[PDB]
Amino acid sequence: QYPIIYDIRARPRKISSPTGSKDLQMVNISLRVLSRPNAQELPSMYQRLGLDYEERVLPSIVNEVLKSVVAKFNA
Amino acid sequence: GELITQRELVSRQVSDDLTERAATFGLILDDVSLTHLTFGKEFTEAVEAKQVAQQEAERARFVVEKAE
């Protein structure tokens, strides 16, 4: 057992997005995502998501979200 | 503009093509997310100038009131 001390305690995140909105106005939207790590399913996190799981996960999913939904929303 | 309006369809069909191409390399693709999208600024600038001209028309309307 290699351990590494995985923090099942929360660790937050924040990501932004410049969207071409419905009026094609450049809408810069910020979005604070609170993603936390699991205990009895630590695996997918620790190794191949890496110790830096949250960093590997959140950024461009937030980008897609904001751009899709803000291209859908006017100013 | 299809990448702004049809983001989700592009993402899904990219997902299908990328899954079938990654199958030949032994990597199963769980999610396929189109995330980055940007375009020329001067287009938005011209749109804003167009809106400015509309608001100038509104100002001229209030000045029409002024002018009666």
Distances from the Cα of A48 to the Cαs of A38, A53, A57, in angstroms? 15, 8, 11
Q: What is the resolution of this structure in A?
A: 22.0
Backbone phi, then psi, for B56, in 5-degree steps? -65, -40
Interface residues of B toward A, Cβ cutoff 8 Å, are 4-5, 7-8, 11, 33-39, 41, 43-44, 47-48
Residue A51: both structure tokens together = 């110790």
CB A56 within 8 A of CB A50: yes
Q: Say whether B36 and A68 touch across the interface (CB within 8 A).
A: no
When CB atoms are compared, the residue of B35, B41, B48 closest to A60 is B35
Contacts for A50 with CB less than 8 Å, ≥ 6 apart: A56
Q: Say whether B7 and A67 touch across the interface (CB within 8 A).
A: yes
Q: Say whether A67 and B35 touch across the interface (CB within 8 A).
A: yes
CB A33 within 8 A of CB A17: no
Query: What is the phi-psi region of residue A67: left when phi exceeds 0, alpha when psi lies from -120 to 50, beta otherwise?
Result: alpha
Q: Say whether A20 and B37 touch across the interface (CB within 8 A).
A: yes
- Which experimental technique did the depositors report for determining this structure? cryo-EM
Of all residues in chain B, the one with the smallest CA distance to A72 is B5
d(CA A74, CA B19): 34
d(CA B49, CA A71): 20
Neighbours of A40 (CB within 10 A): 6
